[model samples]
Target: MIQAYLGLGSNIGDRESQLNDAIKILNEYDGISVSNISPIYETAPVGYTEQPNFLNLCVEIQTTLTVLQLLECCLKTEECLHRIRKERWGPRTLDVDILLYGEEMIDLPKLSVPHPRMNERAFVLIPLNDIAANVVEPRSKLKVKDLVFVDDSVKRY
Candidate 1:
């Protein structure tokens, strides 16, 4: 099984419920088992800064599916939760991203493994470290702990 991490966030109506529901759905998948989950965090927007802050967390999972198949699962979960993909980085009912798929490096038209910008974002790093500090960047071999720290404002929820 590929040990993977996922980043989940929501900023639209009933953010907490959306996140919880998504987790519940993932728990039901046949080949996917949730290993660890971080407390929810609230943070201002990263790219499009005009929107509301997001409730985000990282989830560790052991799955037997291929990277693309895992990504499809995440997308489907988002869709099932009424997530609308209309704008880039826009607010949504649910946002789920495959942060890492074991040590595999993948570059495709629709997906990028080890998520290209994960190391640069505090939201991702904070929750990620909470669950797996030993997680190393596939190519760089740097522990997640060595990366910069995020603000303490991201509380456990």
Candidate 2:
């Protein structure tokens, strides 16, 4: 099995519980185990500025699934959250993004590892740095510690 990282976020529907449920569901899935997790952070919306603030965190998983298979699991987890989320309005729609998969470099029409904007988002790097500070991002050949930059936009949740 290889290690993979996931970025989770939610803006509504009992955010903390939603994230915890996602972690639980993913760990229960076949071929995957939740190995570690970063401290959750609170951050304002990015891109879409009118939305609620987000609760963001990163998870480290040990998995035997193929990259695509893992991605599928993440996607499925996001969908499952919709069915189970405890809110009338959705949140980030329960984002469950695969940030990295071992040291693999991947680019597909539907998904990308090292998640394209991960390096630039404090919301992503701040939490990710907690769990993977020294892990190298294959594309930029930069350590997570090296890539992380914090600002007031990201706060501890």
Candidate 3:
């Protein structure tokens, strides 16, 4: 029913392999098919600086699910990978965030599309630009290409 962008990151336990497996799982899910992927980048920790760097990438998915269903898929993928939440923005084995859901905007307690602070997170934007530079951020009314804010911490892996 929609095209969406998702940002994936992993910092613990074979980051690249975890990212690969998460991508594989999402693509293999019944209602979601990954259509494109950005080149992975390695980035320094943003919140809890004591943690290891993260391997990050963005993926484009075509899905027949509602935004909530997609959120469930992402969460399930993270849970399947054994992501834990002991503290806010703490180290994670996998983190899957919905960056954009087409040009639609949504706000909810559990999830939000055109994800909050996405425009400001170079870690998300830099890779996303690889495949979705032309996709518009409906909230800011700006193209992804225009919203990117370069950061020294993010580098191509």
Top model by lDDT, which number?
3
Q: Each prediction's Cα lDDT score?
A: 0.86, 0.89, 0.92
Q: Write the per-residue lDDT of candidate 3 for residues 2-91, one digit (tens) a residue.
A: 899999999889999999999999999888999999999999877555778889999999999899989999999999999998846677
* Runs of candidate 3 exceeding 4 Å displacement: 87-89
Q: What is the TM-score of each predicted model, taking all chains together?
A: 0.93, 0.93, 0.95
The CA lDDT at 87 in model 2 is 45
On a 0 to 1 TM-score scale, where does candidate 1 land against the true structure? 0.93
Off by over 4 Å in 2: 83-90
| Candidate 3 TM-score, true structure as reference | 0.95
Q: After superposition, how far is residue 16 of candidate 1 from its true place, in Å?
A: 0.9
Model 3, residue 151: distance off in Å is 1.8
Q: Quick one: RMSD of model 2? A: 3.1
Candidate 2, residues 1-157, lDDT tens digits: the string is 9999999999878899999999999999999999999999999888753788999999999999999999889989988888445545444558899999999988899888879999889999999999999999999999999999868999998
**What residue pairs are clashing in model 1?**
none
Rank candidates by TM-score, best first. Answer: 3, 1, 2
Q: What is the C-alpha RMSD of each candidate to the true structure, in Å?
A: 1.5, 3.1, 1.2
The digit string of per-residue lDDT tens for model 1 on 1-157 reads 8899999999899999899999988877888889888988887778766887789999999999888878888998998999887646578999899988898999999998888888888888888998878888786788888874867656666
Candidate number with the higher lDDT (1 or 3): 3
